């Protein structure tokens, strides 16, 4: 034994235990989801209200990369911010050299290679976040989810954090019941519901819902936050479904 004390060490199984321990920090975090719709993507996240003294709507969790990519994550929030900062550097250098904004699969690999690099040496710690991200490019909408190991795939729907099993089940129903696809406005409503349903795993404290989206028709392929009447409409839809 001792194989789990140092990062980048293969155990006799062929496992990196430090990466698996980083997953535990992700599983401890709040629930965050992603839904791929007809011409775009929707992101939503659970924000636990630890106290009345938290200013409502101020502690924003979802982050924009470039102008067309949204990123949300569960686990150690600072680690997620560090990864987004890198993503922003990667997207900037891509656009500097190649003019066009970074495609989503291209962007996915940039994050993937960077996260994977933090599993190669014992001088660094793996990322304590699973990141759900995506947006719209020239080839359409793309949704990705990226783990502490550096592993990522494309998704129809994605979920991570403490209420991931609940969320995944709800996402799987949407895939089955909508083979033709889901609209952007529908996906916002459904995203609200899924976070409210996933909040049963964090039922002790009340929470604040935060949603964002990139859609070709609804936002011109740019990342925007859901605000005001459209946010309240999604909250009302969510509250109606739990009762």
């Amino acid at each position: 034994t001792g194989y789990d004390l140092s990062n980048s060490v293969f155990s006799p199984d062929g496992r990196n235990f430090q990466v698996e321990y980083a997953v535990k920090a992700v599983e401890n975090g709040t629930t965050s989801i992603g839904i791929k719709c007809n011409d775009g993507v929707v992101f939503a996240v659970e924000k636990l209200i630890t106290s009345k003294l938290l200013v409502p709507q101020k502690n924003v969790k979802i982050q924009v990369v470039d102008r067309h990519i949204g990123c949300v994550y569960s686990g150690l929030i600072p680690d997620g911010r560090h990864l987004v900062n890198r993503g922003r550097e990667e997207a900037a250098s891509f656009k500097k050299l190649y003019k066009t904004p970074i495609p989503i699969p291209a962007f996915a690999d940039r994050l993937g290679q960077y996260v994977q690099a933090h599993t190669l040496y014992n001088s660094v710690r793996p990322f304590g976040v699973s990141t759900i991200f995506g947006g719209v490019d020239k080839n359409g909408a793309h949704l990705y989810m990226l783990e502490p190991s550096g592993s990522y795939w494309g998704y129809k729907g994605a979920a991570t954090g403490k209420g991931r099993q609940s969320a995944k089940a709800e996402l799987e129903k949407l895939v089955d019941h909508h083979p033709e696809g889901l609209s952007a406005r529908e996906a916002v409503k459904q995203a609200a519901k899924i976070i409210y349903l996933a909040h049963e795993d964090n039922k002790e404290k009340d929470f604040e819902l935060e949603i964002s989206w990139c859609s070709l028709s609804e936002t011109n392929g740019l990342h925007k936050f859901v605000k005001g009447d459209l946010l309240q409409e999604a909250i009302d839809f969510a509250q109606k479904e739990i009762n």
């Binding site: 430090q18 535990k24 600072p78 304590g128």
Partner: protein, 231 residues
């Protein structure tokens, strides 16, 4: 246990013990309170002395004309982080002729602290900070933890016995947020809040430290006979 030797090592339950031990240094530190209205933001800090011959350790640091913080934990780490804030406020002014937003100041502090939690050789910061400021979107109060987590709040407290002051502010939330255009009453509410964390000792003239920033009020620190009015 076996996973607390350095900051580069997760525990089997996904915890970072060196970061948690750095968090413990804040709890040992002296109490400090932060609260705000829509016009002003206030810091109140209980300063700690070594003995009766010694001075009371300063808790509040000015970062700019419109921004500053109070500390709890390792004071030299607060000096490093406050110096970094001073530079970032200053860069924003010199390059962009722009006062640095309080929210953006929080983001920079988060990212600086994070790098020390993911690399071998270094150590996490051993201090917690309460940043107040007045910018283009009004008054603000931030809480910084050396884990990297920065939070925007109406009011809060950090340090030893900070839970008492935090509960008081949670009750008084609806009252003190409305104290607009009245700096003295907002400080009174902060002094009354920090009083809920005192045991055995009381607020004296060289014990208490208060700072305020607002609409037509630069970040100014009050010590000595300037706070006798509020005792």
């Amino acid at each position: 246990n076996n996973y607390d030797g350095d900051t580069v090592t997760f525990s089997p339950t996904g915890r970072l013990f060196q970061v948690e031990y750095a968090l413990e240094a804040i709890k040992q530190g002296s109490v400090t309170v932060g609260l705000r209205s829509n016009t002003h933001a206030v810091l109140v800090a209980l300063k700690r002395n070594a003995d009766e011959l010694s001075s009371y350790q300063k808790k509040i640091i000015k970062c700019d004309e419109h921004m500053g913080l109070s500390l709890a934990g390792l004071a030299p780490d607060a000096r490093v982080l406050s110096n970094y804030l001073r530079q970032q406020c200053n860069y924003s002014s010199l390059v962009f002729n722009r006062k640095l937003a309080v929210e953006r100041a929080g983001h920079l502090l988060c990212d600086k602290a994070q790098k020390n939690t993911q690399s071998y050789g270094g150590r996490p910061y051993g201090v917690g900070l309460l940043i107040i400021g007045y910018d283009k979107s009004g008054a603000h109060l931030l809480e910084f933890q050396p884990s990297g987590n920065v939070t925007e709040l109406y009011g809060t407290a950090i340090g030893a016995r900070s839970q008492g002051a935090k509960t008081y502010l949670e009750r008084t939330l609806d009252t003190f947020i409305k104290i607009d255009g009245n700096p003295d009453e907002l400080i009174k509410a902060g002094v009354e809040a920090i009083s809920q964390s005192l045991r055995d000792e009381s607020l004296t003239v060289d014990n208490l430290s208060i700072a305020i920033v607002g609409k037509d009020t630069p970040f100014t620190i009050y010590d000595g006979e300037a706070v006798a009015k509020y005792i």
